[PDB]
Amino acid sequence: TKVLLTEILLDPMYDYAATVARIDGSIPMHKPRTPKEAEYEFKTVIGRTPAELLSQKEFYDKIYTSKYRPDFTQLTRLRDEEKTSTLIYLRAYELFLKYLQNAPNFNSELAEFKTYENAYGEQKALLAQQGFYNIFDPNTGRADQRTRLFEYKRLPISTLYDERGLPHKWTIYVYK
Amino acid sequence: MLIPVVCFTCGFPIGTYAAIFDKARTEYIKTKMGGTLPQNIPLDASLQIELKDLITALGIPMRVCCRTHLITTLDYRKYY
Amino acid sequence: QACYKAAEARKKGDKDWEKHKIPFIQNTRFTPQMAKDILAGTLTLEDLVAQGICEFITPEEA
Amino acid sequence: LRPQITYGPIETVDNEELTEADMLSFISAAVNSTGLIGYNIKSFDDLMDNGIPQIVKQMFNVDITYKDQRDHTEIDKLRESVQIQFNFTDVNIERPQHRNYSQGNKINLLPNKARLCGLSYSGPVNLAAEVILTAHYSNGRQEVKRASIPPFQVSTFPIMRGSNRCHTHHLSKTAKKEIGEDPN
Amino acid sequence: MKICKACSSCMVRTYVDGNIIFRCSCGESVQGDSQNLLVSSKVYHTGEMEDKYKIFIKNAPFDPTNCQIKKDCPNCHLDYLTQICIGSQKIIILVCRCGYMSNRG
Ligand SMILES: [Zn+2]
Ligand SMILES: [Zn+2]
Ligand SMILES: [Zn+2]
Numbered sequence: 001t002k003v004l005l006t007e008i009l010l011d012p013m014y015d016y017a018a019t020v021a022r023i024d025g026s027i028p029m030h031k032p033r034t035p036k037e038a039e040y041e042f043k044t045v046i047g048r049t050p051a052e053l054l055s056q057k058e059f060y061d062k063i064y065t066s067k068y069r070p071d072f073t074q075l076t077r078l079r080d081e082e083k084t085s086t087l088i089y090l091r092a093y094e095l096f097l098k099y100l101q102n103a104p105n106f107n108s109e110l111a112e113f114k115t116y117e118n119a120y121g122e123q124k125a126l127l128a129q130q131g132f133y134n135i136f137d138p139n140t141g142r143a144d145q146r147t148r149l150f151e152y153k154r155l156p157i158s159t160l161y162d163e164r165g166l167p168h169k170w171t172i173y174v175y176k
Numbered sequence: 177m178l179i180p181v182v183c184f185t186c187g188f189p190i191g192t193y194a195a196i197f198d199k200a201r202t203e204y205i206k207t208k209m210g211g212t213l214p215q216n217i218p219l220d221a222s223l224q225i226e227l228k229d230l231i232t233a234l235g236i237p238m239r240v241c242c243r244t245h246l247i248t249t250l251d252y253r254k255y256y
Numbered sequence: 257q258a259c260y261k262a263a264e265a266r267k268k269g270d271k272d273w274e275k276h277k278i279p280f281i282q283n284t285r286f287t288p289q290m291a292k293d294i295l296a297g298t299l300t301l302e303d304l305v306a307q308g309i310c311e312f313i314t315p316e317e318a
Numbered sequence: 319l320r321p322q323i324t325y326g327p328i329e330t331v332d333n334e335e336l337t338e339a340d341m342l343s344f345i346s347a348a349v350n351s352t353g354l355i356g357y358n359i360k361s362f363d364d365l366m367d368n369g370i371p372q373i374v375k376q377m378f379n380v381d382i383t384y385k386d387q388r389d390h391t392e393i394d395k396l397r398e399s400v401q402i403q404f405n406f407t408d409v410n411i412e413r414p415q416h417r418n419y420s421q422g423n424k425i426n427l428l429p430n431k432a433r434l435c436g437l438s439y440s441g442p443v444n445l446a447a448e449v450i451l452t453a454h455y456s457n458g459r460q461e462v463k464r465a466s467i468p469p470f471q472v473s474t475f476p477i478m479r480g481s482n483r484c485h486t487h488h489l490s491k492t493a494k495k496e497i498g499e500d501p502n
Numbered sequence: 503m504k505i506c507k508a509c510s511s512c513m514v515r516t517y518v519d520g521n522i523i524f525r526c527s528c529g530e531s532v533q534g535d536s537q538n539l540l541v542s543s544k545v546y547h548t549g550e551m552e553d554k555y556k557i558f559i560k561n562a563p564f565d566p567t568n569c570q571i572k573k574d575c576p577n578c579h580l581d582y583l584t585q586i587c588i589g590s591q592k593i594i595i596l597v598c599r600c601g602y603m604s605n606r607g
Pocket of ligand 1: 183184185186187188239240241242243
């Protein structure tokens with residue numbers, strides 16, 4: 001019993017099922033303080049007593065299943081946004097539980113819910129924008145292109161050599 | 177993980193107008209977003225999203241530090 | 257071809273042989289509308305390659 | 319074959335209005351198509367589905383001959399060598415599994431449990447084979463015995479997290495978030 | 503070298519009484535007449551000879567990575583040429599796609 005409890009209590013699956021059970025009140029919101037509360041939480045979440053888990057053979061067949069069965073067919077895009085978030089969470093739990101149980105007709109529903117969650121993630125990323133600004137060039141109507149970069153230009157040869165072909169030596173300072 | 181209760185620099189009570197500043201800002205972005213995917217907002221190269229008047233209407237003064245921390249602080253709820 | 261035609265006109269004694277030349281133009285096919293379509297999610301790199309706008313270059317091919 | 323497609327003349331393309339900030343969309347598109355580490359996942363995926371099966375089924379055919387070091391017998395004294403010949407036919411790799419309690423049925427092993435318990439995020443490898451043993455006699459004839467072996471698990475191969483053989487691949491982002499994984 | 507007629511092997515060259523005699527491992531012996539009077543040779547500056555760059559100079563007008571120059575080609579009257587700078591003495595060659603090539607080659 002101790003080894004079984006230590007193994008399952010450290011399974012993230014158990015914690016996720018326990019959270020789902022806590023949401024609708026099947027188990028107390030506080031973690032167990034006494035062994036009786038732990039046994040009750042195990043019975044509610046896993047669905048089988050630890051003594052009877054060792055006697056039979058399945059494990060995933062009777063894990064908690066949320067009480068409220070909302071309609072996930074409104075996840076077809078169709079007080080609406082928080083309800084959509086609740087539907088996303090509940091369908092994620094239901095699909096994860098189906099994945100554990102190797103339920104038939106699973107990959108197509110997984111892809112459909114992945115598309116739904118991608119749309120929900122687009123909305124959430126819309127909620128997560130600090131903003132953006134572009135310093136517009138007043139002469140134009142868009143991002144500034146003016147720069148102080150170097151621009152090549154073929155200067156006249158008179159700047160380097162005088163009328164007698166000798167190079168210039170600018171070495172006399174004229175002060176006014 | 178949220179907008180700080182007070183400005184990190186001087187300690188003005190930024191937090192008491194934080195939540196509102198969040199939500200309102202969103203609609204303003206929705207007004208200026210424009211035919212563009214949300215995650216591509218910081219790459220639009222044509223946006224002029226200015227939040228000066230919103231923060232002014234919130235009553236927050238024109239302090240550099242306070243508006244900096246109000247605008248730039250990331251929210252953990254929006255990434256997790 | 258404009259250079260050939262301009263030279264051929266000059267060899268015939270024509271005076272305004274320079275009028276047969278055309279300016280050189282090199283440009284990319286990436287338009288500002290394509291940039292706005294990339295941001296909207298309706299234009300990806302795969303269909304930019306499929307339209308002959310960009311291609312993948314390898315260091316020995318570079 | 320010669321190319322046939324033709325594009326619009328380059329003199330009609332209007333790009334005078336472009337800016338450098340507009341060209342950041344090209345980098346955005348390139349990163350979105352590429353991803354950031356997508357090559358790692360693709361490489362592990364075609365190692366799983368295509369690499370290891372090919373390596374096992376092609377490059378590990380065994381053909382050896384060994385001396386018969388037995389004692390004296392009618393057949394014994396008259397034979398000198400035995401040829402061991404075998405190859406592997408069927409190869410596959412499954413998702414990581416863990417045995418709950420003792421003598422269970424190999425429940426799934428999530429990555430966070432492997433991290434916490436110090437376990438190995440490795441998936442079983444199942445192989446099948448056919449074996450041929452040829453014994454050579456002194457006179458000149460030989461005897462051949464052939465046997466086909468049902469598929470069996472030999473060991474477990476490490477599995478990259480997020481690949482096709484990972485459990486965090488048939489799960490949604492919310493489920494990944496809530497099982498102790500990083501959804502981002 | 504001298505190739506044996508019989509077995510097509512590389513014959514060994516020795517020198518006897520003012521003559522070059524090739525002897526093979528199969529016993530066949532021949533004497534070279536004129537074309538085998540070359541004991542050894544070496545060529546210096548192999549990294550900048552004209553035979554080095556023949557293919558490259560031929561392909562230069564079509565290679566898009568070569569430097570161009572605004573000069574008229576005297577053959578086809580094209581207004582640009584391809585400029586290449588080869589060798590340690592920095593020999594400059596102007597080439598065109600019509601076959602024109604400065605240095606008259
Ligand atoms: Zn402040
Ligand atoms: Zn010979
Ligand atoms: Zn030419």
